[PDB]
Amino acid sequence: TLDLVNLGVAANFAILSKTGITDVYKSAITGDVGASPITGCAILLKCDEVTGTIFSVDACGPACKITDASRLTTAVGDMQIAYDNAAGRLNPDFLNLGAGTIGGKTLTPGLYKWTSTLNIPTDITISGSSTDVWIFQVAGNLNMSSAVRITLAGGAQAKNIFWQTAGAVTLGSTSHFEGNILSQTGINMKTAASINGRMMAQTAVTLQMNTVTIPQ
């Protein structure tokens, strides 16, 4: 029933930011990474940290980098269209579920909105079919605590989950996240946190020894 958020060319990236990608070595990224319009030197990943292509707007950046301004321009533009599309969905199924703390919940499909910061202090399940869609609209920050795991149940797929945040995302140390993040600012991961999803930030993505896998 709820339509997918079309990511266009941004679908090809595990990490896409506008002001760079910082990293505490070593991270494990599966899929392409990019930043635009910032210089490629703002991508602080080593070549042995990415399975995929590192894209740069210029001659600057990691040894393996491909320079491709035009593809990054399209990807970032596509990321902004996706952000606006996700932020623009009307008629939420839920508004202010758990008063902004959703620890222990099982989330069924649909459109969710929070006019605050969303916190996830304890494990949650996202439960639905291989074709169901979840859009989470968050007017503040999104926080997940250390060791918190998002579990998928019933055939729910990470590629059908979208998190739209007006504020910064903070994934706590050793936490496991599921879904696409469309952040208006930063996405900040802590020591050994993992994500099955895409990190699309209109500022920066920051990593500390993270595992990042594009959804299949």
Residue numbers in the entry: 61 to 276
Give excerpts from the publication:
The FfIBP from Flavobacterium frigoris PS1 exhibits high TH activity and relatively strong recrystallization inhibition activity. The FfIBP structure is composed of parallel β-strands in a helical pattern, which is mainly stabilized by inner hydrophobic interactions and intramolecular hydrogen bonds with long α415. Additionally, the FfIBP has a capping head region that consists of two small turns and β-strands, which contain a disulfide bond. This disulfide bond increases the overall rigidity of the protein and reduces residual movement at the ice-binding site, thereby augmenting TH activity and protein stability.
The mutation site for FfIBP_CC1 was located in the top loop of the capping head region, which contained a largely flexible residue Gly121. Among these mutants, only FfIBP_CC1 and FfIBP_CC4 formed disulfide bonds within the intended area. However, FfIBP_CC1 did not exhibit any significant difference. Moreover, MD simulations using the FfIBP_CC1 structure indicated that the disulfide bond formation between C101 and C120 stabilized the fluctuation of residues in the capping head region. Consistent with our hypothesis, FfIBP_CC1, which has an additional disulfide bond on the capping head region, exhibited increased thermal stability, with a melting temperature (Tm) of 65 °C compared with wildtype FfIBP (60 °C). The TH activity of FfIBP_CC1 was akin to that of wild-type FfIBP at equivalent concentrations. The data indicated that FfIBP_CC1 significantly inhibited the growth of ice crystals, even at a low concentration of 0.4 µM, which is comparable to that of wildtype FfIBP. In addition, FfIBP_CC1 exhibited increased thermal stability, even when exposed to high concentrations of chemical denaturants such as DMSO, MeOH, Urea, propylene glycol, EtOH, and glycerol. Interestingly, unlike wildtype, FfIBP_CC1 underwent a two-step denaturation. Furthermore, the incorporation of disulfide bonds into the capping head region of FfIBP enhances its stability and resistance to thermal and chemical denaturation.
